[PDB]
Structure formats: C-alpha cells, structure tokens
Amino acid sequence: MRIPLVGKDSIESKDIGFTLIHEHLRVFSEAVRQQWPHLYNEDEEFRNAVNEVKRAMQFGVKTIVDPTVMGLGRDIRFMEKVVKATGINLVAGTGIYIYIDLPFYFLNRSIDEIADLFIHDIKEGIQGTLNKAGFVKIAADEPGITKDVEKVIRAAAIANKETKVPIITHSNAHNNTGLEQQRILTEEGVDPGKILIGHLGDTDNIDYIKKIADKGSFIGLDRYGLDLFLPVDKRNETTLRLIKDGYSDKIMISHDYCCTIDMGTAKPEYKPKLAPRWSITLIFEDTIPFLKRNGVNEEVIATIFKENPKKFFS
Amino acid sequence: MRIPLVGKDSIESKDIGFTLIHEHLRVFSEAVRQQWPHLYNEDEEFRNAVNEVKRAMQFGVKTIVDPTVMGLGRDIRFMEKVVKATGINLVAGTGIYIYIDLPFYFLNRSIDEIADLFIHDIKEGIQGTLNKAGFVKIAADEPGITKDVEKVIRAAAIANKETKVPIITHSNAHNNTGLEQQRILTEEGVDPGKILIGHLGDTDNIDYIKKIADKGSFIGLDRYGLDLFLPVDKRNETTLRLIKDGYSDKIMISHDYCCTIDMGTAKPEYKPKLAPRWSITLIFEDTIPFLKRNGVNEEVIATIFKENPKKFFS
Ligand SMILES: [Co+2]
Ligand SMILES: [Co+2]
Ligand SMILES: [Fe+2]
Ligand SMILES: [Fe+2]
C-alpha cells in the first residue's frame, strides 16, 4: 500500500486513523544492555509496553509511531511481540540518534554509506526481518550541529529523496537546532512538509515555533507530561495559542513516553518531581479536554491527530 | 587460581607463560551491529580469529589478553568458541571504552554504580556466564580527560581496590592522557605497578614514555604494525633505546591487532598504506629478531613477554 507496519501488511495513509506520532515502547543503550544484561528485565518491559498500548487503544488510538532507532535500542522483534499482543498499528523507523559523534564504525565512511543503511531498512527490512522502516529519525541537542550530526542529517535527506519516507527529528527547543535541521534538510531537496521538527513543545517561545511552521514543517509539541522540560499547563497555553493563531495545519502532539527507559534520570524516585502525570494517555486525560474547554472544536482535534499524520506519511 | 581464563579453569599467574598483553579477537560498535547485522559476517570473524590465534600459538604464545570491552563489542560467547577451537589461554576484561561521553544510560549515575558494573564482571561473571574478568580496561584519546572519561577512570580505581585486578588503558601518546590516567588512578590509591598505560609506542618521544615508567606503571609499546600511528622501524628504535636505558621491567609489547575490526579506517583498501604487515605475529617476524640482533638477550625478551605480564597480574 504505502505505510509499512510492524507485523502487518502495509496500509494506505487514509487508514492511519487516530495517531500518536512520537512514543517509545522501550528505550536503552545498545552497548550497556549488550555488556550488562543483568540490569534489564525483558518480561517487565514487555508488560509495561503492552499495558500502555492497550490503554491508549481504549481511548481510540489506532496507530503509534515509534522513533526508537540506533542509539535508543531499537528492537524490531520486541516491537512485533507487542503488536501481536495488542493489535496496534505500529510504524517503525530507521535512522541514527546521536548528540556529538558517530560510533567509531563510521570513521572514514561517506554520507552515502550512512544513507545506504537507512535505505536498506526502508526497502529490505529491519534487523533481518521483513518489517520495513516508514520514516527516518535524526537528532541534535545541546552540542548543536556537530560534523557527525550533520552527516546524519544529510544521509536522512538522501534516504527521503530515494524512498519518500518522512523525517522525524529530535531537537533542543532552546538552541536553534530544530531550525538548522529544517534548513539543512530543505536545502538538500527535502520537501519541508515531509519533516517533523521535534520537542518544540519544550519551549513557550511562540515566535521560534511559528518560524519553523511557517517554513512548511510540522512542529512537535510532543513531550506532554515531561514537566522538567516544560509543565503541562505551559504546554497547554502554548498549544492553544498556536491553534488560535491558525497553526493546526502544522501542529503534532504526543508524549514521547517510554513505557521503559534505562536512563539514570528515569528512576522511580524522580518521577513525582520531573514527570508526575507522564504517560501515553495524558493528552486524553488533560490536554484535549483543556482545548475543548477553551473553544477548540472536534475538527481541529481530528486535524492534529488524524489529518496531519496522514499528510506527513502521504 | 588467580587469573581467570575464558572457557578454562583459572591459572596461577606464574603459569601464564609467553603472553600477548593487548590483542583483540574481534572489535565492533555494539549499536551498529545490533541495528544492522547485515554488515557483519560471523563465520569470517570466527575463522580469522582462530587462524590468527593458532599462528600465534605456533610461535610459542600461551596467553592472550583481550581488552575488548563495552564500546568495542566484547562478546564472551564468541570468545569461548575461539578458546575451544584453539586451546589458547584467554584473559577477558571489563570496563568502558569512550572518548567523550558515556551512553545515556549513565546520566545521573554515580561513579560507584559504574564500578559495580566492573565488579559484577569480575566477581559474578561476564554477560550471564561464569567467565570472569581479569582486569579493567579504560580509555582516553584526542578529546582528552572529559568528565565522563574521568568518571570511568575513577570507577576503575574502585574496582581495582575491591578486586585487585590490574588496569589496562588506552591513551593518546601525543596529548598527556596517559600521564593523566596514571595520575588520577594513583591519587585514588591504585598501585602504579598495577597499571598498563597503553599506546605509548605511538610516539618516539622517549622522555614522555620514561616519565610514566618512572612513576612505576607499565608502558604499552603495543601497536606494532599500525604504521599510521608510527612505522615499525621507529617503534623498534624506541623499544631498543628504552631497553638499553634499562626499562625492560616496565615494557610490554603487543600488536593491538584486531582479527576483525568494523571501522572504515581499518578496511582492506587502506591496509597497504596504514598497516601493510599488521598481524598477531608481526613481533616474531620483525620486532623480536631485530631486538635480538641488537644485543638484547633471551633474559630480556622473557622479562617482557613472561615476567612483566606475570607481575602485572600478581
Ligand atoms: Co527526542
Ligand atoms: Co586502544
Ligand atoms: Fe523520543
Ligand atoms: Fe586495543
């Protein structure tokens, strides 16, 4: 059809339905898990992911896009288990997630070599399976656009032009990395409407967010629940403002929730402090009702969670 | 019963025999191999490692110390397959190999949690097996002693003090990282004679190397064949000079040979220029005969390849 799904036949974009554009079933450092498996519990990770997905589906979620890639512990076999146990539409991706340098493997390897890896996942399949990647994920954070971060961005552009799959990014909302990602990608021939600039919800700087949307890319208000980056009420005020200003056409919303994450920051005794209400269904429990209370109609909600994702994968 | 071996009973350190203190059976980036297995061929890797180790045993090598740790693709099960096919004494280690930052797993984690990881490998076993680590490996390079790099160094100190296993390091011969590693470790209470400061053979700056040995640590003239860091003839000159100046009892010699390495820098095309005669037996073909034809007696060669490793692990 058009959009590949983990453990299912691919579907036309018209069948995506209500979508969460940025959620993680599970995240871990590949090297750590590989060297110290005693630190992880496969059964527990599985129960948590299955339980989260089931609750999301009870609110009407039909598709989840999971941008777990190299550097975040992408595991296509774990994903297909969750799919088999829930019946969710799951879009997996390919890409590379780094802030500074690439793994030593890429020393003296061209940008084309890197792009070949993405294209392989898109055309052949992921990690020895026939499950194909439906988008490319790239990142940049506090260190900005370093040389290697820039190789990865250009590689994504190459993969997009060859395969037409969209691009999701991770960025730091406070240092201009999002704007730079969009610039570099679009200068390399990527259609701006095929890019989602991520974690823009981490800021309340409306002008910066409009600046990116105005250049034709989707804007990721995609960390709902992560108060440490920005409280739910601040995000809500920003989201409502953008909607009132007529930016529904570019807004995408999600939680960036990790049904499991191995970071030292994601410890249970830090949850009440940094992400008390953080879950894969927080937007149903708070954000969406807040928007409706403030005069946002059902057409707008549908545009954000249905039409936008559809255009993005079309 | 003192030095753990992979796939064998532990040995007394006095039984170690002729030893190669720094060689790799296989090296790769965990994240890359995990996300793109299509890039690797395990049969070739296994065949290459077995062939190299067998040729090494033909030259009288009894023991090989393999500092492949997190970040370099340590794989204890691959290692025991190689032992079963060769009968070599193989010492595995634990530790972390980074130049700049630690994997995100380590955000908000203490130096002690890191040490616990090393201590787990040494006392419990590696990757779910009963094969135990016989030393701790750490690294620092061009980027220098970063915060994360230092945290790892200090973790290694804790592990040494708890388990008594020696410490092997990777350093950059031109930026003082070696001397820094030695300083931080000794300050933390690590016996200098329990430290092998690695890759010092990459420079002909005899003064720098001597300073480190004078501080009481072993010096790694351990990259024989890697001409891109320093040609074999210049290495041999430094080695011979250090021996004549009476540093035999602090010198350790090796190849740092990777029977298989995944990085593009060390791939077939560049080998003829960067490392034309680089293998696990180069020192028997070139280095040792050079030393012996230049007034180095058999007692000195035994001190370097038998006595020094014995002390290091005592
Ligand atoms: Co992100
Ligand atoms: Co090294
Ligand atoms: Fe994410
Ligand atoms: Fe090495």
Residue numbers in the entry:
A (entry chain A), B (entry chain C): 1 to 314
Task: Reproduce, without paraphrasing, sentences from the article in which this PDB structure was first reported.
PLLs are natural lactonases endowed with promiscuous phosphotriesterase activity. The catalytic center contained two metal cations coordinated by four histidines, an aspartic acid and a carboxylated lysine residue. A structural analysis of SsoPox, a hyperthermostable counterpart of the PLL family from Sulfolobus solfataricus, has revealed that loop 7 is shorter in SsoPox than in PTEs; linking the active site to the loop 8, which forms a hydrophobic channel that accommodates AHLs aliphatic chain. Indeed, W263 is located at the start of loop 8, involved in the dimer interface of the enzyme and positions the lactone cycle of the substrate onto the bi-metallic catalytic center.
Compared to wild-type SsoPox, variants W263L, W263M and W263F are the most efficient at improving specific activities, ranging from 30-50 and 20-35-fold at 1 mM and 100 µM, respectively. Regarding the PteSV group, while these variants exhibit higher phosphotriesterase activity, they demonstrate mild improvements for the oxo-lactones and no or wild-type-like AHLase activity (W263L-M and W263F, respectively). PteSV lose their activity before the loss of the global structure (Tm), whereas LacSV do not, and exhibit a similar thermophilicity profile to that of the wild-type enzyme.
